[PDB]
Amino acid sequence: EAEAKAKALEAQYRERERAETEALLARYRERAEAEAKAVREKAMARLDEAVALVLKEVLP
Amino acid sequence: IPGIRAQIRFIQQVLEQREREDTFRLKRIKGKIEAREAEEEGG
Amino acid sequence: KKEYTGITYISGPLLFVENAKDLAYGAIVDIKDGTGRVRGGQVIEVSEEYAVIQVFEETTGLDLATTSVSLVEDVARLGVSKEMLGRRFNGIGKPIDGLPPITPEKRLPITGLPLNPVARRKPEQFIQTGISTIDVMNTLVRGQKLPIFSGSGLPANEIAAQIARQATVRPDLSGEGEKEEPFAVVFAAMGITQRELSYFIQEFERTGALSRSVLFLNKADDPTIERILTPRMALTVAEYLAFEHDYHVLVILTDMTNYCEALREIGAAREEIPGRRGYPGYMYTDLATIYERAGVVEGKKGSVTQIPILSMPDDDRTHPIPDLTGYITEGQIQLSRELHRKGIYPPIDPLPSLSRLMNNGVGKGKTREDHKQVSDQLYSAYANGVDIRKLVAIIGEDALTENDRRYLQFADAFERFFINQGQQNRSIEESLQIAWALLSMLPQGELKRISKDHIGKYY
Amino acid sequence: GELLVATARTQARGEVLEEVRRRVREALEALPQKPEWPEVVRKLALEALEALPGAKALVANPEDLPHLEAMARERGVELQAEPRLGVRAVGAEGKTQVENSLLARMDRAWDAMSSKVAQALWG
Amino acid sequence: MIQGVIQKIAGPAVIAKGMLGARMYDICKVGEEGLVGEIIRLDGDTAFVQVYEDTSGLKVGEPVVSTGLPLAVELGPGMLNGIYDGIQRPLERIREKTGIYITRGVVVHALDREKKWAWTPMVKPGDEVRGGMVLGTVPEFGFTHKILVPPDVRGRVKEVKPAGEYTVEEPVVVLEDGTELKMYHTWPVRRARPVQRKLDPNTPFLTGMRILDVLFPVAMGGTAAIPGPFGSGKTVTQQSLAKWSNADVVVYVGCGERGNEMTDVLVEFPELTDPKTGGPLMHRTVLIANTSNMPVAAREASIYVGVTIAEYFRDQGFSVALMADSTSRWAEALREISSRLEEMPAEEGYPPYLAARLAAFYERAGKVITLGGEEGAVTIVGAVSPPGGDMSEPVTQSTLRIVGAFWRLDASLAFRRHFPAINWNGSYSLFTSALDPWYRENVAEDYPELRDAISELLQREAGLQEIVQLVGPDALQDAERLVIEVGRIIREDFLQQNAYHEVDAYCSMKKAYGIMKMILAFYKEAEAAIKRGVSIDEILQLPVLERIGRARYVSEEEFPAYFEEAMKEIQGAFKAL
Amino acid sequence: PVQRKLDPNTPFLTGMRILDVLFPVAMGGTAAIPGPFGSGKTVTQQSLAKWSNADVVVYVGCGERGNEMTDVLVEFPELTDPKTGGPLMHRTVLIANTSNMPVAAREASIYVGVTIAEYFRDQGFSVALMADSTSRWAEALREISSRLEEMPAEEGYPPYLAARLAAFYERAGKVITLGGEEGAVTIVGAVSP
Ligand SMILES: Nc1ncnc2c1ncn2[C@@H]1O[C@H](COP(=O)(O)OP(=O)(O)O)[C@@H](O)[C@H]1O
């Protein structure tokens, strides 16, 4: 029964581990998509300026 | 032991000196090619 | 972009193109033809009226009629972004990460000369590994160049990236913390096969274990030329990491056999005057010059721990390649066929294997003062026992005395249990425990390369 | 997880940065037909002209070279042939043929300052 | 292309003229003996001739006019069955136009542009297709070979011909780019085919034997190697692999060959029973022979032709079984160049291009999913002649970490009954650990165990070996001759394989398995005998040892029941005594 | 020059008994010792010199590994010359050479100490030549001799295979210098396998 009880632990140990680690991914990924967007968004506004600047070096 | 030592001993060296020639033979060739042909910075 | 045609003469990987007054050694330019095709070639041996380019392509869809040079950049060498860290690379490094290019925080010529003679300082600090045996018998410290003698069809390779990922830079036990030690894992392969290449993707990529690492790796498939420079990258880059911005670094080579194999080809044509094994000295040179990134420079605890990693073929130091190493490097760590066969993980030889400097970072409650004699306990304790092991069909565990019969049994428990460990990531302290235990099988009437006092602390 | 976020952002910034590059590049291709364009011609035409100590003729496309009157008079006194996104020069025998592409200039500034330009964007 | 005739009568690697703008490595038409060149160095208008074909008429002013393009295999119908020169010339056509003797300038046309071969429309016009996309069916055998879009040759359809027997170069789709897919394509050897993405082994090839099929299990998509010494095993140790393979397409290619042995390959494949079919092994074999009398560059060609096929097929998911007849002659072929080209080779006359001429090429493919969306198992069999014999040839070290398996061949070992009795440490196939999943189910979970079980003894036995050589069984602990003798059967029925001992013509997983228990048992029963105190002699003198001694005399089918008795006969000739 | 070279036949004191008792030194010759890795040979050179019997200390590397190539410097004042009271470093010219060093760096390394020694020697000063991997010096020589038209058509050894060797040892003894005094010019050849 010291083996048995521990067997009963194991289930949960794999399950809870699975469920959470798998869940952690959801949280990260779906936040990754978002955070990726937010550096795009910072640029969007002040973006034009970049083109303008870059264009200016190349032009003469 | 000491016999079988001496074998290696023999080998080695014999292999080795051959190896001079490699270069020596090839070398002389290099000299030719380069002497006729290495004057492209002159023309 | 300075054009020059005047390609006269196209031989093998070499190429003349006229001019060569304007050029500074170690140069590269794109020759583009009618197809405009890019082939790439270092501009080597600048003559005067011509150059010598050593291109790397195939010269087909190529026209002597239209040739030129878009002057690319002679002394081209990397930029650098130490914070570009999610990077994964092939050879020289074009994104195998596929992530958008670095921010050249600085720009690094890959050569610059190593350290200062007056910079370096003799070792003084251990670093744990996640492996047992390779911390006990031979004990990892920072600024240590530990060659790891591999052989042919072996899983050296595995035990590399394996113990790689296990690793965590550590000196907690000494009385210091671990907060201010950045851990820089720099990884570099070469000559990678389809199979192997994915094992890579497996480890880093396993979880985010690239969470502290970069790949760089010139396939066999890839040109042997670009190959050469491959290390020089992370070599140079590594400085910028720890020496310029403290990390506690890990040099991880790959059979540098390859470099040199690769080296050869260049010369074989270039008429590079031989040396031994036809191989002209400077192998000598270069090899020195690489691992001179060891030692602790003042103001930087962020010193690099080095692992030079190659194999001998006939597995003798006969080959220059180990010899060389074996003259300058601080150790030796071999692996046996037998060993792997016996399934010992790590499968690392005994007496053949040794960390030359390791007193310094150990002991003193950093791993116990007792680590010392534990190291020479088990050495001789073990080694004796293989005497027994090897006299067995002659005289078995009968003719034997008890003690020595235990020293057969010691050996058995030593190899099987300690040195094999599979993939378990032991802890340095968790490694020492074992030691005690195994030795406990033998009486203290059969222990003495540790004081009884100390052995009784863990008996 | 942190590593997934990190890639995501860095990746994202590239998509932006590349866009800005493209617009300039695209812009540089709408330049040969501009009204302020003949003027630009001879700038790059001159730039190339400095680079060759030899000379022969100054070559640029239609939508380029015809406009050039400055060095249609000067240099080789010609408006010979056509290669637009640059002006190149010829002179002093072969092997000297140097260019200065508008797009190689793009690639010059772009390739470098993928850093400062990125700064102009973020920060 | 660029016009020239012989400018400077100078070797069979001559100097042409009028050849500026030249593309190195480009096929040409040269002279009048059907002669053809390769741009093998440049000097503006004057060009380094690579000379394939012979002359005995080298003089000045003889054509040397390039093509500005370079080499190509006519890929498509007709390859399977019927020999192909290293020129990819169906030697039949030649023989019919030559005679018994071979004669050049006899250009023949590789595929039948003059025969009627079925086709099928399957697509639509006003629509389009990309590379590697099915078109119709030209057939031949149950090894039916539809035709796909050749890639790099991919556009918008405009018609789709009605099914019908047509010539191979007949278009059968014309495209709205005015272009036309036809049923075959000549294609540069040098160019290497793209794919959808790289796939990797985990599945094991089986060459129907035991050594390299369990003891060094062969990987499906594998890579391999063998130095087979001089008049000392290789060739004849390589053919049965052909007729014991799970190949989709067998690709027999031999280079530099001895004519006679290909009068025992080429004319023997008809009289080979395809088991996946019935008739000629030539059903899925092309046959691509080249000899050493046949030129040097043909000697190269050979190789690079079966690459192309391998790729062509790989796309089409065909599980290439290529087996290469030693490169070393090839090596020589390059390396004789060096001298004549007045060059500084790599060591002892080894051309310097080596890595160059090996390495990319070898790691081109092996079980790799394609744009054909199928797994072409480019399973390639590297053979080497160690002409020095030395276990230290360049060629070796370069082989390192490129093959998947490697083995070496002892001669007086092999001169005996067991050809090939080799050192397994004179070998290694690390390509064997990823097949363990697959084995675990497929054969069994102790199918990988039981192979581990052998090796334990086999290398530890060396342990003992030395002491043998330090005295021999002459009063040494009763573990002795246990092992010794054990190992004997382990090579004798268990791995002494022969096509000719037709009882052991083939060997299976399960057969091997059977065995793996047969013996195991006998061993086991020896353990508890001797532990009980038994002297091994009588264990020696067991008939059931001979019952296992029929185990290469026991074919696979027979095996189940055969073995099932012997596990008893063991115990009867063991527990008892 | 030094006028006559006379008889070095007064032995060199080293302060460790048995050594000189067993195999003494004279005072300006050519000695040797092997001793590679493990059993820290460095022991000797430190203690040796500590007592010595020379009034000048001379050292360099040629192949010695980085940190250790710095170690020397460190151990110098640790060595207490009670003659001076303070450091042995007092009577110490130091030269060095790791191994990454410039080509002719290594080649000169040697030459340095030797030349200089004579200076002092000529002035009446007992100098103290030692050795770090004498054998490894030669490595470099091979390298050097490599890149040349010539070669070790010797046996993988630089031609001038007694050349550099010679003067290196011929120069020594109990000189009656130009200054008329003497400078003890003891050398120990640690080719140290
Ligand atoms: N499995 C085998 N059983 C018997 N003989 C074999 C076997 N495999 C190879 N041989 C022997 O190989 C000999 C010839 O060598 P071969 O294998 O053709 O290669 P090589 O060209 O390297 O000599 C044959 O005479 C044949 O007896």
PDB file of N, CA, C and O and ligand atoms in Angstrom, chain E residues 228-238 414 417 419-420 497-498, ligand 1:
ATOM      1  N   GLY E 228      35.718  -2.624 -48.741  1.00  0.00           N
ATOM      2  CA  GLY E 228      35.828  -4.019 -49.017  1.00  0.00           C
ATOM      3  C   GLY E 228      37.117  -4.170 -49.721  1.00  0.00           C
ATOM      4  O   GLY E 228      37.211  -3.712 -50.856  1.00  0.00           O
ATOM      5  N   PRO E 229      38.140  -4.757 -49.139  1.00  0.00           N
ATOM      6  CA  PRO E 229      39.419  -4.867 -49.783  1.00  0.00           C
ATOM      7  C   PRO E 229      39.422  -5.638 -51.068  1.00  0.00           C
ATOM      8  O   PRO E 229      38.484  -6.347 -51.414  1.00  0.00           O
ATOM      9  N   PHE E 230      40.542  -5.457 -51.753  1.00  0.00           N
ATOM     10  CA  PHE E 230      41.015  -5.968 -53.007  1.00  0.00           C
ATOM     11  C   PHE E 230      40.989  -7.456 -53.090  1.00  0.00           C
ATOM     12  O   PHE E 230      41.697  -8.135 -52.350  1.00  0.00           O
ATOM     13  N   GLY E 231      40.131  -8.004 -53.997  1.00  0.00           N
ATOM     14  CA  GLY E 231      39.928  -9.429 -54.186  1.00  0.00           C
ATOM     15  C   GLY E 231      39.690 -10.080 -52.859  1.00  0.00           C
ATOM     16  O   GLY E 231      40.387 -11.016 -52.472  1.00  0.00           O
ATOM     17  N   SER E 232      38.842  -9.390 -52.075  1.00  0.00           N
ATOM     18  CA  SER E 232      38.692  -9.626 -50.691  1.00  0.00           C
ATOM     19  C   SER E 232      37.419  -8.940 -50.293  1.00  0.00           C
ATOM     20  O   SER E 232      37.432  -8.032 -49.463  1.00  0.00           O
ATOM     21  N   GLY E 233      36.280  -9.510 -50.769  1.00  0.00           N
ATOM     22  CA  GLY E 233      34.936  -9.199 -50.345  1.00  0.00           C
ATOM     23  C   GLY E 233      34.495  -7.821 -50.654  1.00  0.00           C
ATOM     24  O   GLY E 233      35.265  -6.887 -50.484  1.00  0.00           O
ATOM     25  N   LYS E 234      33.231  -7.691 -51.082  1.00  0.00           N
ATOM     26  CA  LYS E 234      32.565  -6.479 -51.408  1.00  0.00           C
ATOM     27  C   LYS E 234      31.504  -6.864 -52.362  1.00  0.00           C
ATOM     28  O   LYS E 234      30.327  -6.866 -52.050  1.00  0.00           O
ATOM     29  N   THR E 235      31.894  -6.977 -53.626  1.00  0.00           N
ATOM     30  CA  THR E 235      31.037  -7.067 -54.756  1.00  0.00           C
ATOM     31  C   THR E 235      30.050  -8.102 -54.621  1.00  0.00           C
ATOM     32  O   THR E 235      28.855  -7.851 -54.673  1.00  0.00           O
ATOM     33  N   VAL E 236      30.550  -9.312 -54.424  1.00  0.00           N
ATOM     34  CA  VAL E 236      29.710 -10.416 -54.288  1.00  0.00           C
ATOM     35  C   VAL E 236      29.059 -10.345 -52.978  1.00  0.00           C
ATOM     36  O   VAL E 236      27.878 -10.662 -52.907  1.00  0.00           O
ATOM     37  N   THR E 237      29.680  -9.720 -51.958  1.00  0.00           N
ATOM     38  CA  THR E 237      28.878  -9.488 -50.803  1.00  0.00           C
ATOM     39  C   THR E 237      27.808  -8.402 -50.972  1.00  0.00           C
ATOM     40  O   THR E 237      27.116  -8.094 -50.014  1.00  0.00           O
ATOM     41  N   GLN E 238      27.597  -7.799 -52.168  1.00  0.00           N
ATOM     42  CA  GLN E 238      26.606  -6.763 -52.324  1.00  0.00           C
ATOM     43  C   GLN E 238      25.375  -7.037 -53.143  1.00  0.00           C
ATOM     44  O   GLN E 238      24.606  -6.113 -53.362  1.00  0.00           O
ATOM     45  N   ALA E 414      36.889 -14.233 -44.023  1.00  0.00           N
ATOM     46  CA  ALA E 414      35.907 -14.315 -45.010  1.00  0.00           C
ATOM     47  C   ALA E 414      36.259 -15.353 -45.974  1.00  0.00           C
ATOM     48  O   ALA E 414      35.379 -15.854 -46.630  1.00  0.00           O
ATOM     49  N   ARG E 417      34.181 -20.027 -44.593  1.00  0.00           N
ATOM     50  CA  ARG E 417      32.761 -20.109 -44.706  1.00  0.00           C
ATOM     51  C   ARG E 417      32.119 -18.791 -44.458  1.00  0.00           C
ATOM     52  O   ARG E 417      31.268 -18.401 -45.243  1.00  0.00           O
ATOM     53  N   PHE E 419      32.108 -15.438 -44.990  1.00  0.00           N
ATOM     54  CA  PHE E 419      32.330 -14.265 -45.752  1.00  0.00           C
ATOM     55  C   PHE E 419      30.920 -13.786 -45.556  1.00  0.00           C
ATOM     56  O   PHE E 419      30.054 -14.494 -46.062  1.00  0.00           O
ATOM     57  N   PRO E 420      30.530 -12.716 -44.885  1.00  0.00           N
ATOM     58  CA  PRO E 420      31.361 -11.754 -44.199  1.00  0.00           C
ATOM     59  C   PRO E 420      31.356 -11.956 -42.709  1.00  0.00           C
ATOM     60  O   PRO E 420      30.434 -11.515 -42.028  1.00  0.00           O
ATOM     61  N   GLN E 497      25.106 -16.433 -43.513  1.00  0.00           N
ATOM     62  CA  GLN E 497      24.073 -16.223 -44.468  1.00  0.00           C
ATOM     63  C   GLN E 497      24.650 -16.401 -45.803  1.00  0.00           C
ATOM     64  O   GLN E 497      25.831 -16.149 -46.033  1.00  0.00           O
ATOM     65  N   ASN E 498      23.804 -16.918 -46.704  1.00  0.00           N
ATOM     66  CA  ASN E 498      24.242 -17.192 -48.020  1.00  0.00           C
ATOM     67  C   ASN E 498      23.006 -17.177 -48.828  1.00  0.00           C
ATOM     68  O   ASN E 498      21.969 -17.662 -48.405  1.00  0.00           O
TER      69      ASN E 498
HETATM   70  N1  LIG G   1      27.977 -14.169 -48.295  1.00  0.00           N
HETATM   71  C1  LIG G   1      28.987 -14.807 -48.950  1.00  0.00           C
HETATM   72  N2  LIG G   1      29.178 -16.167 -48.990  1.00  0.00           N
HETATM   73  C2  LIG G   1      30.198 -16.643 -49.709  1.00  0.00           C
HETATM   74  N3  LIG G   1      31.130 -15.991 -50.407  1.00  0.00           N
HETATM   75  C3  LIG G   1      30.940 -14.670 -50.341  1.00  0.00           C
HETATM   76  C4  LIG G   1      29.918 -14.041 -49.669  1.00  0.00           C
HETATM   77  N4  LIG G   1      30.024 -12.688 -49.821  1.00  0.00           N
HETATM   78  C5  LIG G   1      31.078 -12.500 -50.554  1.00  0.00           C
HETATM   79  N5  LIG G   1      31.681 -13.673 -50.915  1.00  0.00           N
HETATM   80  C6  LIG G   1      32.883 -13.860 -51.676  1.00  0.00           C
HETATM   81  O1  LIG G   1      33.308 -12.677 -52.266  1.00  0.00           O
HETATM   82  C7  LIG G   1      34.303 -13.084 -53.201  1.00  0.00           C
HETATM   83  C8  LIG G   1      34.755 -11.975 -54.119  1.00  0.00           C
HETATM   84  O2  LIG G   1      34.777 -10.728 -53.437  1.00  0.00           O
HETATM   85  P1  LIG G   1      33.633  -9.721 -53.690  1.00  0.00           P
HETATM   86  O3  LIG G   1      32.628  -9.847 -52.621  1.00  0.00           O
HETATM   87  O4  LIG G   1      33.189  -9.825 -55.076  1.00  0.00           O
HETATM   88  O5  LIG G   1      34.452  -8.350 -53.592  1.00  0.00           O
HETATM   89  P2  LIG G   1      35.932  -7.628 -53.972  1.00  0.00           P
HETATM   90  O6  LIG G   1      35.783  -7.058 -55.371  1.00  0.00           O
HETATM   91  O7  LIG G   1      36.203  -6.571 -52.923  1.00  0.00           O
HETATM   92  O8  LIG G   1      36.886  -8.798 -53.918  1.00  0.00           O
HETATM   93  C9  LIG G   1      33.618 -14.235 -53.889  1.00  0.00           C
HETATM   94  O9  LIG G   1      34.600 -15.106 -54.436  1.00  0.00           O
HETATM   95  C10 LIG G   1      32.732 -14.844 -52.806  1.00  0.00           C
HETATM   96  O10 LIG G   1      33.180 -16.118 -52.400  1.00  0.00           O
END
